[PDB]
Structure formats: structure tokens, C-alpha cells
């Protein structure tokens, strides 16, 4: 009928997440649940509480993301899985590349994030 | 190391070993209803997947993993995320991103979802 639902939901989710991320990361708790997991630069965080503290604690003042590419697929358990590739610009730091992954689940008529993995692309020096 | 990391690590080892050696044998780690997104293009089902992979235009390929992250999901699956480099034949080294969703079926771990993307300079 045109665009599959996972494409629609994934895309809108991604957009909403970065907007929140780029304007007020303290509001990020809304997209996670207690059983959510976050791996940020190789470090794992379990649970909404620990996740939000971590993200709230980043030393950036101004952050801006840019998506180069996003891919979405439905999973067998009816979840939505997405892979994002893009660039980040924080404060006066140099532009960095990153990759992000999200696993979405519909809970209570709502799509929430149960798994989030983020890793920066390092410059080969 | 946590259980999920042990499984993820092995799977990837398995995957790239096959990829780099006998890619026509990759079917072994997929299921009939597997899904592959390769550079933005979708390949649905084992048969489509295998053809696609077997058909890549190079003869020799080699991968190297720069970083690998693994997580367990609430529904018993495992998500494996990798960043790396590869060299195919005589082409220059290219950066890449790959992600896998692993499921335990019939007592073994298989890949149900696979997403691959080359990095841009």
C-alpha cells in the first residue's frame, strides 16, 4: 500500500529520538522502559534509571546529529529493528561518525525502545 | 565474559570465517525467513540471501573487526553490532558496519536479521 509499517514507525521514532537527544536529553527517559539496555561506547547500562543518568551526564553542551542512512526491518517476534549511520557534531569538537542501533517493541499501544547500542567511529591515526 | 558476549563472539567468528572462505556456505546460519538489507537493498529469504552473497563480484575478501558489541533482548535473542574493515581482491580497504539479530531455534543460534553498510569517506 506503499510504505511498510516498520519503515513508518522506525523512521518516525528515529526522528523523534534525535530531536529529543539534540534539545533536551533529560526527556529521553520517556522512550525507555525499566528493562531497557544501553551500550554506549562499549559500556553497558541496564534499566531506565541508569540509562538516563548516563545520557544526562555526557560532557557536551551542544550536540547535533545528522543521519547519513537508516535501515529498518521487522523481527520475527514482531519487534522493529533499526540501524543508523551518521555524523555527530558536539560543541567545538571535530565531526565524528557514529553507528546506532535500536530495537523497538509495542507496549501498551506504544512503541518503546528496549535495546540501544551506540558506538563512535574513531579516526585511524 | 557474559553469556551473550560468548554467543555473539562465536557467531561472528563463524560468520566471517565462512564469508572469507566459502561464502556459498553461509546458508547454514540463516533460516528460510531470514532478512538481509545490503547497502540499502533488501533480500528476503534464505535463497535470495545466499544468491546475493554468493554472487558478489570479488574473488577474495577479508574482514577485520574493529569493535563488536553484544546485548541480550527481553525475548531471548541476541543483537550483535560490528564495525570493521575489509579488503576485497585489489581494491582499497573499506570501512563497514554490520548488525545481526540472533535467535535460538531448534537448540542452535541462527541469524534472523542482517543489516550491512559500507562506510563513507
Amino acid at each position: 500500500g506503499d510504505k511498510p509499517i516498520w519503515e513508518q514507525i522506525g523512521s518516525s521514532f528515529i526522528q523523534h529520538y534525535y530531536q529529543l537527544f539534540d534539545n533536551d536529553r533529560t526527556q529521553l527517559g520517556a522512550i525507555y522502559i525499566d528493562a531497557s539496555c544501553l551500550t554506549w561506547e562499549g559500556q553497558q547500562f541496564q534499566g531506565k534509571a541508569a540509562i538516563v543518568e548516563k545520557l544526562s551526564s555526557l560532557p557536551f553542551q551542544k550536540i547535533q546529529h545528522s543521519i547519513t542512512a537508516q535501515d529498518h526491518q521487522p523481527t520475527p517476534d514482531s519487534c522493529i529493528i533499526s540501524m543508523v549511520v551518521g555524523q555527530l557534531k558536539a560543541d567545538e569538537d571535530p565531526i565524528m561518525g557514529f553507528h546506532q542501533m535500536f530495537l523497538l517493541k509495542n507496549i501498551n499501544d506504544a512503541w518503546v525502545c528496549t535495546n540501544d547500542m551506540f558506538r563512535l567511529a574513531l579516526h585511524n591515526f
Side-chain angles (χ1 to χ4, degrees), chain A:
Chain A
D2 271 24
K3 260 163 212 180
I5 191 230
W6 53 88
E7 264 290 303
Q8 316 189 29
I9 296 331
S11 272
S12 59
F13 176 83
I14 278 352
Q15 190 181 0
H16 179 248
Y17 173 95
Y18 296 113
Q19 282 42 325
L20 252 45
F21 207 116
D22 300 355
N23 315 240
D24 176 20
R25 35 184 226 277
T26 79
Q27 305 180 69
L28 245 17
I31 66 122
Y32 296 112
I33 60 177
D34 292 273
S36 299
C37 273
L38 166 81
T39 301
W40 184 274
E41 272 307 284
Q43 202 169 352
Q44 194 181 281
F45 304 83
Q46 298 189 197
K48 181 156 145 159
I51 284 162
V52 187
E53 130 224 297
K54 171 54 184 194
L55 306 171
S56 271
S57 86
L58 305 174
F60 322 118
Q61 290 188 328
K62 298 168 143 196
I63 170 105
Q64 139 152 329
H65 310 59
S66 75
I67 310 282
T68 295
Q70 65 181 294
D71 290 312
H72 318 275
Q73 303 175 341
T75 78
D77 290 277
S78 278
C79 288
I80 297 167
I81 191 173
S82 305
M83 178 173 79
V84 176
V85 183
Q87 296 187 317
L88 86 84
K89 176 37 170 226
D91 299 324
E92 277 297 336
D93 302 295
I95 301 172
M96 290 162 296
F98 76 89
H99 78 192
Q100 196 157 15
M101 170 286 144
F102 309 100
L103 184 65
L104 307 187
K105 204 196 204 166
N106 191 117
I107 281 133
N108 267 339
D109 233 73
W111 288 101
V112 297
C113 182
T114 67
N115 293 267
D116 187 350
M117 302 184 152
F118 171 90
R119 181 165 290 276
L120 275 166
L122 296 194
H123 188 134
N124 33 19
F125 264 130

